[PDB]
Nucleic acid binder design. Structure first.
Lengths: 125, 201, 60, 69, 141
RNA sequence: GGAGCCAGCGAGUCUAACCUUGGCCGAGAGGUCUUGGUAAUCUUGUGAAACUCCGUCGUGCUGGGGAUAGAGCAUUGUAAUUAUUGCUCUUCAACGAGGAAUUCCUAGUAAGCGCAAGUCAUCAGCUUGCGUUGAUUACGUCCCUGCCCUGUAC
RNA sequence: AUUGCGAUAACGAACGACCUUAACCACUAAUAGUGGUGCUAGCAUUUGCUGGUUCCACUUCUUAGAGGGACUA
């Protein structure tokens, strides 16, 4: 039908899920434009995967994300991870491997947590 | 420039950040310099960041916290007394307002003023109990820790039973300590430690 | 005035509680003239100290 | 002594000439070097900004920051 | 096109509350200005005249975004902590009598209607009304 | 004061009356008519609190703090007086960061915040567990406290 | 640590000091989730965007049970 992938991100108990497909660059979280994500002070924490690679990369794809559990802060860290992982997975299948690793180089230079969950867990009894 | 329209329009002012990372999208890390050669390795100002909140874990290896950016090191020490524990988002807002004030009282790049206060305030000699006391030298990492603690403690006490807000008093401390001004709480504390050490050496 | 010196070797813990490390330090302005000093905080090789008194030597 | 809570004509005249002198003005500053109470200062800033005498750079209800221009 | 989801929360609500008050059709309970709105509160609402319109707007938006709601869930939503004096704080529900009349009032002007499976659901006229105010709020930028 | 708005671990009736959605009445506590569930299915997305945004207050034991006390309205129980618990109006105490002493603690840890279960007609400031927000300071030693090991018929 | 090289009037023997978590992956199943399809509301009208309610496909997320995945590297 149409080229598409789905990927997920984790933080502590939040679980973001993202669908990516070909289209016209729009990014929505729970049906609302990403410019409205809250709290305000953390909003740049979500722009990172966009500004770090450059907006030109998104013009041909639609991202929509749902976030479910956790808390106000932990679920912000979930969605940024789901976007980054989603973006490389799309390139990995539908363009060359060269551009795929070009993306990774940018992300892992800035912050490892964009791709890999931090693996901290509550202390047992 | 690169306006690059999208079906969800990102505001112009965010697109302009696409070229260089600025703290709070406001001030540049470029041309910030640690003026004392002894501290260059211990004041992280080289990796830029957008906002002073990170998940990073630094407790696991004993020198690893030297890599944490100085602005985040500062925000942590505001979260101090028991009524404020865990309230980091409160602390982040305080820093955001503080840098603004320093950009109006005086006119330097405010992140430069912070670096001056840190380097200028850390004690350089101390004492230990043997009873009697003996004078000893102090290591560069501890110099940074002492500076941060003295600065925020002075700010906290100045703003208790106050009229000025935390941001007002923290801003005034930093400015006075970038100068050699003894009016700042932290400068007085440094002097007493060193003159006592001189007496006992 | 102040004098800078570079840590070249760490010798061991000292003091009644282990709160102090003994270190061998090389002057930065000119090599040699090495001296041994007591340092209060955590310290590593290549760290730089600010010796505010020069002609003094650690106990032993 | 006590801070004023109603605006006499003398202080009104005083405000309009003094405030353009300061680099930085906030609720705390007007309460400090002028002697009006905090409930006046919140009113004065909104009036002076509307009138164009002071320049805003950020507003946050729990903090406000205005400059000479 | 535009949807309510495209507008910031405490910006849509202020706009719609101001509009709704001018039309004057929204019927107020009359015991307004005595009631605390919650048994957990201390002092009544501080905006003496406007506060009933503000809540009417908030309820309408909250229903629009959801499948259906009833009075009990609204009491949970607007609840809060009560001080309980020297004992530790606890969660407490808001007044039922306010919220019930709010829903009844909105139903008379036709924004909301009773759903099967209980509770209230948005009317198609409610959709049309709220979507219009959304467009105006962005356009004013 | 108004607005925004997000969890995890539990527990529930036919033996009969447990957990309760929705409609109506009441300022509130509460009442009343129906309904789903012997449960990954229904209560329950347990829409929790801290928290975020916009306003009022202006350093005055003050709009901080809420003990003691008066009047009235409800709910459990065979029975609330020496007063189980809840609500409303009024009363408005000490307390301005605490001497000598002394407890716990090295990472999703301390501390802040709330929820469920236990007991149980009603009655928690208690005990156990769970999640939310999330630091500073070591990565050492035998100084203090305490434990352990390797000359002489005593 | 009676945990071991060697030495040699000794040689050869006896108690105390394995089992479940965290973490990756094939297999299950659905009372959990996703997508499509029929119908349908609002906005706008490149034919989109956000929702409500009859079937179909799937198992990645969830699930829980089972199977395998550090010796000082």
């Amino acid at each position: 039908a149409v080229p598409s992938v789905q990927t997920f991100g984790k933080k502590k108990s939040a679980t973001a899920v993202a669908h990516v497909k070909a289209g016209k660059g729009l990014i929505k979280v729970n049906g609302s434009p990403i410019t409205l994500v809250e709290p305000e002070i953390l909003r740049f924490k979500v722009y990172e995967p966009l500004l770090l690679v450059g907006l030109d990369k998104f013009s041909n794809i639609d991202i929509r994300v749902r976030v479910t559990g956790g808390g106000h802060v932990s679920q912000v860290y979930a969605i940024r991870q789901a976007i980054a992982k989603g973006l490389v997975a799309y390139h990995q299948k539908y363009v060359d491997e060269q551009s795929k690793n070009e993306l990774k180089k940018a992300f892992t230079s800035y912050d490892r947590t964009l791709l890999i969950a931090d693996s901290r867990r509550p202390e047992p009894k | 420039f690169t306006p690059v329209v999208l079906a969800t329009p990102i505001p112009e002012e965010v697109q302009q950040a696409q070229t260089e990372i600025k703290l709070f999208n406001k001030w540049s890390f470029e041309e910030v310099e640690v003026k004392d050669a002894s501290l260059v390795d211990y004041v992280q100002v080289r990796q830029p960041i957008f906002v002073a909140h990170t998940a990073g874990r630094y407790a696991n290896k004993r020198f690893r916290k030297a890599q944490c950016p100085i602005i985040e090191r500062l925000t942590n020490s505001l979260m101090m007394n028991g009524r404020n524990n865990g309230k980091k988002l409160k602390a982040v807002r305080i820093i955001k307002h503080t840098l603004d004030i320093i950009n109006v009282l005086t006119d330097q790049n405010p992140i430069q003023v912070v670096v001056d206060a840190i380097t200028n305030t850390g004690p350089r000699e101390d004492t230990t109990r043997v009873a009697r006391r003996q004078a000893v030298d102090v290591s560069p990492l501890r110099r940074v820790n002492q500076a941060i603690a003295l600065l925020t403690i002075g700010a906290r006490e100045a703003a208790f039973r106050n009229i000025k807000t935390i941001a007002e008093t923290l801003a005034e401390e930093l400015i006075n300590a970038a100068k050699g001004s003894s009016t700042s709480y932290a400068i007085k504390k440094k002097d007493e430690l060193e003159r006592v050490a001189k007496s006992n050496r | 005035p102040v004098t800078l010196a570079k840590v070249i070797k760490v010798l061991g813990r000292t003091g009644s509680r282990g709160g102090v490390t003994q270190v061998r330090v090389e002057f930065l302005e000119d090599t040699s003239r090495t001296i041994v000093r007591n340092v209060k905080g955590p310290v590593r090789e290549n760290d730089i100290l600010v010796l505010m008194e020069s002609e003094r030597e650690a106990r032993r | 002594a006590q801070h004023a809570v109603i605006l006499d004509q003398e202080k009104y005249d005083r405000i309009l000439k003094e405030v353009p002198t300061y680099r930085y003005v906030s609720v705390s500053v007007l309460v400090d070097r002028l002697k009006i109470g905090g409930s006046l200062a919140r009113i004065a800033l909104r009036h002076l900004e509307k009138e164009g005498i002071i320049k805003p750079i950020s507003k946050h209800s729990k903090q406000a920051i205005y400059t000479r221009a | 096109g535009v949807s309510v989801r495209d507008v910031a929360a405490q910006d849509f609500i202020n706009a719609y509350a101001s509009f709704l008050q001018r039309q004057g059709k929204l019927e107020v309970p009359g015991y307004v200005d005595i009631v605390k709105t919650s048994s957990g509160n201390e002092m009544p609402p501080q905006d003496a005249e406007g506060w009933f319109y503000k809540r009417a707007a908030s309820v309408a938006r909250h229903i629009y975004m959801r499948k259906q709601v009833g009075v009990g869930k609204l009491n949970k939503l607007y609840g809060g902590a009560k001080s309980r004096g020297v004992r530790p704080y606890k969660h407490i529900d808001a007044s039922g009598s306010i919220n019930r009349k709010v829903l009844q009032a909105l139903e008379k002007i036709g924004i909301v209607e009773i759903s099967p499976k209980g509770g209230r659901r948005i009317s198609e006229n409610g959709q049309r009304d709220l979507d219009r105010i959304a467009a105006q709020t962005l356009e004013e930028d």
